[PDB]
Amino acid sequence: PVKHLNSKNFDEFITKNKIVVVDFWAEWCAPCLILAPVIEELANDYPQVAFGKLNTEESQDIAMRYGIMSLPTIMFFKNGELVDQILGAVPREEIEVRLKSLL
Amino acid sequence: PVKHLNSKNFDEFITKNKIVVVDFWAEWCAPCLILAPVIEELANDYPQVAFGKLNTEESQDIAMRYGIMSLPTIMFFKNGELVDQILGAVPREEIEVRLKSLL
């Protein structure tokens, strides 16, 4: 249920979907890899939210445009606008409380 | 004067050199790219310190071993041991004050 985002489809994803979570990650980032299964299970439980993953090395232009630097970066979008973020691994509860507020 | 480090030569670099600075960076990281010229000029002024750069995407095993997550990460080594770090872009003065303490 988690979309693999790229430079070409990123804008469409956050435009067509009202409430969006984007996981900005990298292959070398241990907390990123650790967080991925929890993002997957959250995507399962919250089909009313669109979840996407953006590999910073793969889509460097998206990473730069958002000034990504601290990983994982979990960004929350509503109506195409960045409304919240989490920097670094956090508990599932941290993500879930922020999701429920946006819903 | 800044060495390009990789998985094979990393340990040697921080072992053979008593005082070392390592710049952990990525191509998509704007503060990383911004900081690179200042690292270069510092390497110029401090030939008594070995400076190296480690591209996280290139040497993922080194990145993971050190639990790198927040970029740029500037790590300071003495006798092969991590003794200080800076997370994120900082002024040159921040790096220079920490360098002078280690010297």
Side-chain angles (χ1 to χ4, degrees), chain A residues 1-40 42-52 54-92 94-99 101-103, chain B residues 1-40 42-52 54-92 94-99 101-103:
Chain A
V2 183
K3 183 150 152 76
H4 296 196
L5 303 174
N6 73 16
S7 312
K8 163 263 141 44
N9 66 24
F10 186 83
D11 277 357
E12 189 173 336
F13 186 68
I14 65 162
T15 301
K16 88 202 163 204
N17 296 288
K18 173 117 175 175
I19 308 301
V20 164
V21 166
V22 178
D23 169 12
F24 286 86
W25 72 288
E27 292 152 34
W28 50 261
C29 167
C32 300
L33 296 178
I34 277 179
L35 188 73
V38 357
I39 294 302
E40 293 288 339
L42 272 169
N44 246 117
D45 294 340
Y46 286 93
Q48 67 278 34
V49 178
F51 287 78
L54 188 293
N55 179 340
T56 51
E57 183 66 27
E58 183 175 45
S59 304
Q60 302 188 356
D61 57 337
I62 305 301
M64 179 144 309
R65 183 220 289 192
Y66 288 94
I68 300 296
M69 59 195 94
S70 179
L71 296 187
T73 290
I74 302 158
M75 290 196 156
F76 295 80
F77 289 86
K78 172 184 182 182
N79 290 320
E81 186 174 40
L82 176 68
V83 302
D84 204 351
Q85 64 164 202
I86 298 171
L87 300 185
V90 289
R92 168 184 159 112
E94 202 96 278
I95 304 168
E96 193 173 17
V97 189
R98 300 193 201 218
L99 268 172
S101 296
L102 283 160
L103 284 167
Chain B
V2 183
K3 183 150 152 76
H4 296 196
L5 303 174
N6 73 16
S7 312
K8 163 263 141 44
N9 66 24
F10 186 83
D11 277 357
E12 189 173 336
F13 186 68
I14 65 162
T15 301
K16 88 202 163 204
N17 296 288
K18 173 117 175 175
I19 308 301
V20 164
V21 166
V22 178
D23 169 12
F24 286 86
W25 72 288
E27 292 152 34
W28 50 261
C29 167
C32 300
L33 296 178
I34 277 179
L35 188 73
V38 357
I39 294 302
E40 293 288 339
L42 272 169
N44 246 117
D45 294 340
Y46 286 93
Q48 67 278 34
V49 178
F51 287 78
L54 188 293
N55 179 340
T56 51
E57 183 66 27
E58 183 175 45
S59 304
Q60 302 188 356
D61 57 337
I62 305 301
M64 179 144 309
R65 183 220 289 192
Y66 288 94
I68 300 296
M69 59 195 94
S70 179
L71 296 187
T73 290
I74 302 158
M75 290 196 156
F76 295 80
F77 289 86
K78 172 184 182 182
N79 290 320
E81 186 174 40
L82 176 68
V83 302
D84 204 351
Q85 64 164 202
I86 298 171
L87 300 185
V90 289
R92 168 184 159 112
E94 202 96 278
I95 304 168
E96 193 173 17
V97 189
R98 300 193 201 218
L99 268 172
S101 296
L102 283 160
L103 284 167

